Predict the structure of Lanthanide-Binding Peptide.
Amino acid sequence: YIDTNNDGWYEGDELLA
Ligand SMILES: [Cl-]
Ligand SMILES: [Cl-]
Ligand SMILES: [Cl-]
Ligand SMILES: [Tb+3]
């Protein structure tokens, strides 16, 4: 995964495929 919002987690739209 890519932590695009750099919050330290993989979540939300970062998981939206
Ligand atoms: Cl990756
Ligand atoms: Cl990342
Ligand atoms: Cl889809
Ligand atoms: Tb994130």
Q: What stands out?
A: The radius of gyration is 7 Å. The chain has no helices and no strands.
